[PDB]
Enzyme design. Structure first.
Site, PDB file in Angstrom:
ATOM      1  N   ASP A 135      30.380  33.896  37.422  1.00  0.00           N
ATOM      2  CA  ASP A 135      31.328  33.489  37.770  1.00  0.00           C
ATOM      3  C   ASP A 135      31.303  34.214  39.846  1.00  0.00           C
ATOM      4  O   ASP A 135      31.858  34.350  39.773  1.00  0.00           O
ATOM      5  CB  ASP A 135      32.736  33.893  37.038  1.00  0.00           C
ATOM      6  CG  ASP A 135      33.634  32.930  38.030  1.00  0.00           C
ATOM      7  OD1 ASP A 135      33.624  32.277  38.584  1.00  0.00           O
ATOM      8  OD2 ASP A 135      35.211  33.435  37.596  1.00  0.00           O
ATOM      9  N   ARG A 139      35.430  34.381  45.881  1.00  0.00           N
ATOM     10  CA  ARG A 139      36.715  35.038  44.949  1.00  0.00           C
ATOM     11  C   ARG A 139      36.786  36.221  44.498  1.00  0.00           C
ATOM     12  O   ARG A 139      37.532  37.106  44.012  1.00  0.00           O
ATOM     13  CB  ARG A 139      37.772  33.900  44.963  1.00  0.00           C
ATOM     14  CG  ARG A 139      36.952  33.502  43.335  1.00  0.00           C
ATOM     15  CD  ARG A 139      37.848  32.320  42.946  1.00  0.00           C
ATOM     16  NE  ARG A 139      37.761  31.917  41.522  1.00  0.00           N
ATOM     17  CZ  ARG A 139      36.072  31.280  41.656  1.00  0.00           C
ATOM     18  NH1 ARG A 139      35.486  30.788  41.428  1.00  0.00           N
ATOM     19  NH2 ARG A 139      35.728  31.317  39.949  1.00  0.00           N
ATOM     20  N   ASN A 140      35.310  36.487  44.175  1.00  0.00           N
ATOM     21  CA  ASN A 140      35.845  38.099  43.656  1.00  0.00           C
ATOM     22  C   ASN A 140      33.990  38.834  43.931  1.00  0.00           C
ATOM     23  O   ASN A 140      33.806  39.880  43.026  1.00  0.00           O
ATOM     24  CB  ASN A 140      34.731  37.232  41.637  1.00  0.00           C
ATOM     25  CG  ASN A 140      36.023  36.529  40.741  1.00  0.00           C
ATOM     26  OD1 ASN A 140      36.190  36.744  40.970  1.00  0.00           O
ATOM     27  ND2 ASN A 140      35.068  35.186  40.253  1.00  0.00           N
ATOM     28  N   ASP A 153      35.322  41.002  39.758  1.00  0.00           N
ATOM     29  CA  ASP A 153      34.956  40.120  37.909  1.00  0.00           C
ATOM     30  C   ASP A 153      34.639  40.433  36.852  1.00  0.00           C
ATOM     31  O   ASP A 153      33.875  39.687  36.302  1.00  0.00           O
ATOM     32  CB  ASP A 153      35.241  38.700  38.731  1.00  0.00           C
ATOM     33  CG  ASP A 153      35.353  37.662  37.714  1.00  0.00           C
ATOM     34  OD1 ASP A 153      36.357  38.118  36.727  1.00  0.00           O
ATOM     35  OD2 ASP A 153      34.727  36.492  37.709  1.00  0.00           O
TER      36      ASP A 153
HETATM   37  C1  LIG Z   1      42.085  45.805  39.010  1.00  0.00           C
HETATM   38  C2  LIG Z   1      41.195  45.316  38.914  1.00  0.00           C
HETATM   39  C3  LIG Z   1      40.502  45.669  37.456  1.00  0.00           C
HETATM   40  C4  LIG Z   1      39.181  44.843  37.157  1.00  0.00           C
HETATM   41  C5  LIG Z   1      38.048  44.348  38.782  1.00  0.00           C
HETATM   42  F1  LIG Z   1      36.762  43.655  38.257  1.00  0.00           F
HETATM   43  C6  LIG Z   1      38.770  44.541  39.698  1.00  0.00           C
HETATM   44  C7  LIG Z   1      39.949  45.311  40.272  1.00  0.00           C
HETATM   45  C8  LIG Z   1      40.734  44.667  41.197  1.00  0.00           C
HETATM   46  N1  LIG Z   1      40.270  46.016  42.095  1.00  0.00           N
HETATM   47  C9  LIG Z   1      40.398  46.174  43.266  1.00  0.00           C
HETATM   48  N2  LIG Z   1      40.662  47.155  43.778  1.00  0.00           N
HETATM   49  N3  LIG Z   1      41.570  46.869  45.746  1.00  0.00           N
HETATM   50  C10 LIG Z   1      41.568  44.980  44.471  1.00  0.00           C
HETATM   51  N4  LIG Z   1      42.537  44.485  46.094  1.00  0.00           N
HETATM   52  C11 LIG Z   1      41.441  44.919  43.914  1.00  0.00           C
HETATM   53  C12 LIG Z   1      42.036  43.871  42.309  1.00  0.00           C
HETATM   54  C13 LIG Z   1      41.656  43.544  42.082  1.00  0.00           C
HETATM   55  C14 LIG Z   1      41.786  42.199  41.103  1.00  0.00           C
HETATM   56  C15 LIG Z   1      42.491  41.154  41.051  1.00  0.00           C
HETATM   57  C16 LIG Z   1      41.728  41.413  42.852  1.00  0.00           C
HETATM   58  C17 LIG Z   1      42.596  42.756  43.554  1.00  0.00           C
END
Ligand SMILES: Cc1ccc(F)cc1-c1nc2[nH]nc(N)c2c2c1CCCC2
Length: 260
Positions: A135, A139-140, A153
């Site tokens: 994926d 976006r990821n 992701d």
């Molecule tokens: C929280 C989280 C869990 C698993 C993962 F793979 C990624 C994350 C994660 N870490 C992050 N750090 N800083 C961000 N803006 C952020 C975001 C996500 C996920 C949704 C998009 C925003």
């Protein structure tokens, strides 16, 4: 494995996102004797079952295997308490796609290639370990205040290699196809691959040998690398290690970027 974080070390600030899986928040993590850091927090949706919890802590498990500057860093999990949480490093500029689209035209070619080099470096590490993302898309990828890009992701037709659509054959080589699409996204500041073409239009175009053109003002050497990534035969595509080496070379010899 993934580290257990005492829920008292955590302070939630705001919800930054939502989805069917639940919610992502931003907040602060302060472990005794250590500096406070900002973190993102993913929480499981209300009323989750035991199955769903396990599927959730399984994603943390996987993330926990990866220690690389271009892969999102897992701080830890909360499991002693309810609700369960996954805590990662806070990435100030969020998702790469959204980010570029809010900053259309604002960076230099060299900065964009830097971002692509970081993504390539994370994918080499991932595929080194026999992991297939499946994926990979702008976006990821998440972006920090220093513009460091990190793979996140842990389906989308326009991003997916032909053999993965046709035979559900997913490998590091179909990830390289997806990486090519990411390069095109980046150099275009988040345009939609194939624009208004339908999914079926895309599939048949690819099959007949159509490939996306350079984004506006994109160096020819970068577009040529996208074309390498989109070779029809998966075995003909460059490996991530070669992708990274090619980008280092362009960066090391900036005149190679002049030709557009
Ligand atoms: C929280 C989280 C869990 C698993 C993962 F793979 C990624 C994350 C994660 N870490 C992050 N750090 N800083 C961000 N803006 C952020 C975001 C996500 C996920 C949704 C998009 C925003």
């Amino acid at each position: 494995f993934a580290k257990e974080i005492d829920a008292s070390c955590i302070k939630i600030e705001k919800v930054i996102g939502v989805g069917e899986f639940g919610e992502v928040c931003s907040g602060r993590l302060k472990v005794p004797g250590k500096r406070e850091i900002c973190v993102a927090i993913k929480t499981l949706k209300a009323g989750y079952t035991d199955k769903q919890r396990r599927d959730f802590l399984s994603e943390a498990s996987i993330m926990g295997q990866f220690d690389h500057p271009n892969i999102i860093h897992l701080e830890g999990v909360v499991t002693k308490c309810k609700p369960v949480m996954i805590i990662t490093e806070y990435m100030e500029n969020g998702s790469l796609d959204a980010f570029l689209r809010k900053n259309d035209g604002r960076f230099t070619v060299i900065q964009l290639v830097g971002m692509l080099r970081g993504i390539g470096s994370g994918m080499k590490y991932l595929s080194d370990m026999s992991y297939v993302h499946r994926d990979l898309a702008a976006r990821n990828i998440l972006v920090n205040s220093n513009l460091v890009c990190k793979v996140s992701d842990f389906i989308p037709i326009r991003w997916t290699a032909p053999e993965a659509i046709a035979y559900r054959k997913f490998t590091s080589a179909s990830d390289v196809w997806s990486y090519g699409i990411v390069m095109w996204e980046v150099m275009s500041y988040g345009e939609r691959p194939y624009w208004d073409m339908s999914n079926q239009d895309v599939i048949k175009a690819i099959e007949e040998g159509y490939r996306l053109p350079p984004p506006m003002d994109c160096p020819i050497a970068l577009h040529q690398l996208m074309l390498d990534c989109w070779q029809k035969e998966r075995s003909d595509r460059p490996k991530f290690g070669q992708i990274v080496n090619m980008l280092d070379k362009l960066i090391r010899n900036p005149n190679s970027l002049k030709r557009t």
